[PDB]
């Protein structure tokens, strides 16, 4: 059922856990570095887990998609064909920016954080900068021990702060991926949908130095020896059975003003969905004619597709449950309840008014701010602005450098510049520049940016063409030129005749001012947000409702049972799908073009010892009433005995609006069954070496 519970809430859910069927003790789940919780790792943006004592890590195909795509070319397309390393020396690097984070310690820092904030006094900008300074110090202290990365999390609008310390594995390798037609069976058609028939898995291996310490990729590295790893279930998972997930959900907005919901539904999602669908169309059309553009853009395209469809589905779910009306009524009830408390409600009523005003300030420039951000996120403008900003930051002492541009961020920056080689084609990026220039030009006078208007020197199709022709003269298209500029100094950027660098130099002062506006708004938010959100929480508890913080990329637990759901009267979705359902969808065309070995094996009823006799087949995917979101892709699903029974990978269509208003009847996790991972690796795209390593051979 509902709830992305923090580990500290375990006492509160221990009862519920027992009642839903957990047979492990709550103490055993409390130990976040023990068995089995210590096997759960952040990737992040996704979750994963260890599954062998020699550092094998299982996650979803969508989570490894970037890695697979980085190792693919038009001629040798691992997204399409799969990958399998027969021995660990055949494993390929997942990319310099790939990471496995293993949890080491969580520390409550709430009191200190809040004291650092109060010390700033009345000024909003100073308040932001005080919290930044606190965070940077804390993190520097925590990361003094070599091999560890730390992160500061704010919960419940700034009412609680915790510091996480992780071991940071920096040499992640691809060990196995099923072919794309298994990994992403049904593609974007079946994404966000049940019935689902998707082999949504892949394997990495984590590596460290011979001294046991994290290191970047080197042939002298060796597999990491995890303290804990998961084991596959020996009992067949069935309808009604207990399941739990631990992982790293990114963000939810269940605590939000009505107006923040209204702006999101009425403007944010439709705008972003439109821009994304427009970019998809161009890249799709271009890739039909150029298989290099098709492979290099595939991961970008997977994300545009996934997010735009998600937003379409949220808009549809809001209408299904009248989310606008629920938010309006709930807020009118909270505001009544506050007014009724006289004196002591006033600070929350005041915080509400201040939050609403801050949203209005945001809103006045939203089109400008979005359009500029996305124009500047095309590949060459993005490279030039990032690198020029790095050069500005490098002239300051490290502790005063903007987060993302400190010494601790240089590996990521550099790795990004290298990875882009596999994700950029000039002729494609040009069409994306043109799209964004055309969108910029539609902005009204008061949403335009002087620097960009001047640089453009016109407001029509001729001017756009002239600007694109100018930018096409950049040399940032090559990896080596980008790294040259990664190390260069500010004056070297300001002297350049590289047209993308010139753009960055021209707009930078404007980006910096906009950043200051955002920092300022954020400082006012730091004052008002905790007070209102606490009231929201207090109201929810007085109503007997579940109280848990919105997701914020930190470790959460969710639990429940395997069960279907009913989309409409006269119909139910069953909890499982089956192998015969995969073949029923075969068309021989992407995304319904399963490997021939799959089609043959099902036709011959080769079930590989994995048949669940209660469904008459090997199970493929299943539904459960767990509470997961973006970030939970790849999270292990565990049974009553803490054994692996699948991996979380998606939500059903109606579930996605739960990011704003939770609907228990239509919110389900979609998970890929452990048995289907094993089945594919036996009968379809075999990996006997992995099955043996996981003691299922």
């Amino acid at each position: 059922g509902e709830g992305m519970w923090v580990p500290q809430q375990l006492p509160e859910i221990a009862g519920p856990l027992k009642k839903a069927g957990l047979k492990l003790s709550p103490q055993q789940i409390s130990d976040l570095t023990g068995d089995p919780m210590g096997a759960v790792v952040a990737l992040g943006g996704c979750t994963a887990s260890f599954v062998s004592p020699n550092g094998l890590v299982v996650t979803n195909h969508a989570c490894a998609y970037g890695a697979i795509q980085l190792n693919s070319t038009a001629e040798n397309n691992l997204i399409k064909n799969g990958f399998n390393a027969p021995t660990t020396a055949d494993e390929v690097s997942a990319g310099p920016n790939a990471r496995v984070f293993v949890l080491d310690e969580i520390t409550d820092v709430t009191k200190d954080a809040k004291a650092a904030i109060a010390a700033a006094g009345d000024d909003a900008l100073a308040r932001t900068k005080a919290l930044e300074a606190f965070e940077k110090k804390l993190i520097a202290d925590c990361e003094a021990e070599a091999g560890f990365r730390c992160r500061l999390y704010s919960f419940s609008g700034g009412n609680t702060y915790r510091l996480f310390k992780n071991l940071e594995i920096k040499d992640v390798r691809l060990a196995y991926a099923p072919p794309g037609s298994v990994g992403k069976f049904g593609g974007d058609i079946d994404n966000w949908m049940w019935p689902r028939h998707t082999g949504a898995f892949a394997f990495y291996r984590a590596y460290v130095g011979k001294d046991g310490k994290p290191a970047a990729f080197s042939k002298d590295n060796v597999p990491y020896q995890p303290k804990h790893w998961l084991k596959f279930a020996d009992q067949p998972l069935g309808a009604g059975d207990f399941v739990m997930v631990a992982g790293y959900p990114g963000s939810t907005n269940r605590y939000a003003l009505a107006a923040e919901f209204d702006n999101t539904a009425q403007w944010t999602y439709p705008t972003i969905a439109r821009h994304y669908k427009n970019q998809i169309a161009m890249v799709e059309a271009a890739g039909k004619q150029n298989a290099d553009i098709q492979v290099k853009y595939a991961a970008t395209m997977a994300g545009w597709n996934n997010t735009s469809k998600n937003y379409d589905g949220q808009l549809e779910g809001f209408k299904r449950i009248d989310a606008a009306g629920q938010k309006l009524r709930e807020e009118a009830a909270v505001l009544g309840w506050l007014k009724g408390q006289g004196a002591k409600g006033q600070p929350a009523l005041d915080a509400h008014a201040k939050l609403l005003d801050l949203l209005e300030q945001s809103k006045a420039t939203r089109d400008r701010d979005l359009t500029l951000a996305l124009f500047n996120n095309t590949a060459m403008l993005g490279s030039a602005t990032q690198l020029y900003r790095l050069s500005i930051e490098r002239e300051k002492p490290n502790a005063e450098r903007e987060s993302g541009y400190q010494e601790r961020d240089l590996p990521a920056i550099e790795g990004g510049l290298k990875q882009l080689e596999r994700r950029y084609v000039a002729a494609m990026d040009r069409q994306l520049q043109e799209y964004w220039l055309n969108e910029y030009i539609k902005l009204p006078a008061d949403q335009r940016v002087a620097a960009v208007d001047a640089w453009l020197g016109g407001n029509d199709a001729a001017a756009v063409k002239r600007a694109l022709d100018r930018l096409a003269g950049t040399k940032l298209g090559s990896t080596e030129e980008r790294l040259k500029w990664f190390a260069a100094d500010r004056k070297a950027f300001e002297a350049s005749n590289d047209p993308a660098i010139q753009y960055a130099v021209a707009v930078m002062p404007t980006l910096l001012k906009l950043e200051q506006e955002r920092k300022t708004r954020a400082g006012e938010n730091l004052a008002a947000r905790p007070v209102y959100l606490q009231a929201l929480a207090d109201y929810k508890k007085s109503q007997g409702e579940f109280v848990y913080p919105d997701a914020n990329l930190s470790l959460r637990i969710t639990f429940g049972n395997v069960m279907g759901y009913a989309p409409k009267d006269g119909m139910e979705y069953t909890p499982f799908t089956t192998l015969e359902g995969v073949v029923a969808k075969e068309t021989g065309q992407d995304p319904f073009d399963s490997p021939k070995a799959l089609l043959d094996a099902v036709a011959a009823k080769r079930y590989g010892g994995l048949e669940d006799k209660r469904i008459g087949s090997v199970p493929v995917n299943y539904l459960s009433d767990l509470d997961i979101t973006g970030g939970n892709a790849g999270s292990p699903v565990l049974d009553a005995h803490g054994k692996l029974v699948g991996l979380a990978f998606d939500g059903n269509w109606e579930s996605v609006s739960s990011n704003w208003v939770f609907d228990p009847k239509m919110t389900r996790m979609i998970a890929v069954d452990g048995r289907y991972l094993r089945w594919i690796m036996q009968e379809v795209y075999p990996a006997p070496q992995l099955l043996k390593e996981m003691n299922v051979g």
Binding site: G44, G45, C46, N60, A62, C63, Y65, N191, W192, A200, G250, S251, Y276, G303, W304, N306, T307, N310, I628, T629, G630, G631, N632, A633, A648, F649, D650, G651
Partner: peptide, 6 residues
């Protein structure tokens, strides 16, 4: 799929 929004 529940990867991070893009």
């Amino acid at each position: 799929v529940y990867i991070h929004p893009f």
